Nucleic acid binder design. Sequence first.
DNA 1: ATGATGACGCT
DNA 2: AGCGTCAT
Length: 430
Amino acid sequence: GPHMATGQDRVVALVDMDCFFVQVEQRQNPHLRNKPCAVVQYKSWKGGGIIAVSYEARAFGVTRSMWADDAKKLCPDLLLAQVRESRGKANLTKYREASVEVMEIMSRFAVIERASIDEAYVDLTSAVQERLQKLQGQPISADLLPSTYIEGLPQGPTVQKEGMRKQGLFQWLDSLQIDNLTSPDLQLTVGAVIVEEMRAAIERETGFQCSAGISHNKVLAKLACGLNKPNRQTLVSHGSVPQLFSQMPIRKIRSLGGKLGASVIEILGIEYMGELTQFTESQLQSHFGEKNGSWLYAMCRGIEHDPVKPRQLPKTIGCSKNFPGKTALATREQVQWWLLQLAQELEERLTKDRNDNDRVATQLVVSIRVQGDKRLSSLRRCCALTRYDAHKMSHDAFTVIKNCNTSGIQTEWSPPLTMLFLCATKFSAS
DNA sequence: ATGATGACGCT
DNA sequence: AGCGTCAT
Ligand SMILES: Cc1cn([C@H]2C[C@H](O)[C@@H](COP(=O)(O)NP(=O)(O)OP(=O)(O)O)O2)c(=O)[nH]c1=O
Ligand SMILES: [Mg+2]
Ligand SMILES: [Mg+2]
């Protein structure tokens, strides 16, 4: 009890842009706003692959990874925006630039870790301290939390969705201990006021809406984010964890959505995150390894220590294209041509990066998939990246992969390539 | 024929 | 180094 750490030491948020590529296209084209719409890449095979979906289209069953032609059977009035195509591949520059717009705004409030093109974690611990002093010991108005849900409330002795939100919020704030500058629940609340302000700023300055989770660590912040979407934010307190976890499938917790999560379920014969509390740390470590067992033991109690890394910029800059089915690359000249295309996009991105962010990449990773392999990558090789020159980079990547060709006739490439990937890495200051 | 990315762990 | 996992 008096020596048990409760993982209540930080305030962490996760901010996630709602249907982000869709919002980028809707800002640009007002005819798409407030409509069922999706973002598609390519167009020939089955209308293109959907990669993002507006909340109005999701109500019809439209999802990512559906073909647009199939999405149209569920939602006949679905509007589509197409990803730009440059040098015969998808080019995500518009979405990268929009993400930078958002991240720069977030960075005014606190330390951010870029988690993906449209998510960042935020460490609010310091911001909350500072804000607790100036606000003094005076109370926090619900009007400062207009889009916040307090997970697990209301509870105890209304018919509308906004009404439930306000009821829980009132219960929370009515129990808050406002004169104890170290109360975790108070710290979270202030964190949430800050996140409201951050979200208001993003929307005002970009037009983009997002959801957010506020809790004591990244895993709980991420989970919290997804609980009330879109355009809302959710506070998951330490106290809320036992009930929340008691029915929370294991696969919903970040890092457990794959093979390890499935093994936890199979080996232990459990279904929900809270059920982990029944095992000793050594038991868990015995099944899953020292690092994973320790992490699971703390996580199922709501405790997690992964720091929010101060990193707003990606650490690698890469370009790839899949060549599925009949388009698989089968001649030396095709392979070379496509490496050049990839290397030209890459050069463009790298030069821009070098001007914007004062750094230079030094390693080039070359990855390919071959026809028949159900892995992301059949093969990865590195080479020095000494000049930002597309012809050099493509020539080098070719060199590095060329003996993968089993074909006897030199013009041909067997087995055919179903993926090419160039990745610039090992950045240094410039 | 679920694409184009990106981070990190294991050995 | 190069492969495997998990994620958006
Ligand atoms: C998961 C995922 C996302 N994305 C892009 C499209 C989304 O617009 C953007 C953000 O991903 P997300 O946060 O997973 N999804 P979303 O932002 O579209 O939707 P949500 O509102 O966050 O659910 O990333 C992909 O291109 N491929 C993916 O597999
Ligand atoms: Mg999102
Ligand atoms: Mg996201």
